[PDB]
Design a protein around this ligand. Structure first.
Ligand SMILES: [Zn+2]
Length: 224
């Protein structure tokens, strides 16, 4: 208990979360490099997009200058949710923003696609979840990549970010990313801050990375 209640979220926020985890498209590219910055806690990827009608460039925000230095210049893979609202730094009017979602490319490939085990409870009762639901090709994966996939299943299966009206029964929820080599990382499914992207997605800014090898996800849902 002590997770945020769905009712504590204001108007637009709920809709924007559903926009984020169900409707919007995600960025996903392999082998990209750049030493281009805007602000010292950022890395600017010019020409990131090449078939997207609106956007051209991509500005990734990080926690600090230190973290930037780690990927700056290196060959990286990108996987995350981006937005255009209140976003600038690159090609004027054609830049998209994104928090984290960057891992080092070289030596992070897995011979085979890893399917991440999901244990799910609804008011205590266990519910079986298909294994192809969440998967990755990285030894080291950002929590964001796994998180985006898991919440999409939660939307489809449980109408998670829908209004009570449109069959949204879950009122409180918690997602846990468990690993043995380290302490777990868990998110209050209803704890995002703010109403729009730029603020809601700020949770992936730490660019948290966990090892996919022998790891699973725990989800707890409550209709009250
Ligand atoms: Zn567990």
């Amino acid at each position: 208990k002590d997770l945020r209640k769905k009712s504590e979220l204001q108007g637009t926020a709920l809709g924007n979360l559903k926009q984020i985890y169900y409707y919007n498209e995600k960025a996903k590219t392999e082998n990209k490099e750049s030493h281009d910055q805007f602000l010292q806690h950022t890395i600017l990827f010019k020409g990131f997009f090449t078939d997207h009608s609106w956007y051209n460039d991509l500005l990734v925000d990080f926690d600090s200058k230190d973290i930037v230095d780690k990927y700056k210049g290196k060959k990286v893979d990108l996987y995350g949710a981006y937005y255009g609202y209140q976003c600038a730094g690159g090609t004027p009017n054609k830049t998209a923003c994104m928090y984290g979602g960057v891992t080092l490319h070289d030596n992070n490939r897995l011979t085979e696609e890893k399917k991440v085990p999901i244990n799910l409870w609804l008011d205590g009762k266990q519910n079986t979840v298909p294994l192809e639901t969440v998967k990755t090709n990285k030894k080291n994966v950002t929590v964001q990549e796994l998180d985006l996939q898991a919440r999409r299943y939660l939307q489809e299966k449980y109408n998670l970010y829908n209004s009570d009206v449109f069959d949204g029964k879950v009122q409180r929820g918690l997602i846990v990313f468990a690993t043995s080599t380290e302490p777990s990382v868990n998110y209050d499914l209803f704890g995002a801050q703010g109403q729009y992207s730029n603020t809601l997605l700020r949770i992936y800014r730490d660019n948290k990375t966990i090892n996919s090898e022998n790891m699973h996800i725990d989800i707890y849902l409550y209709t009250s």
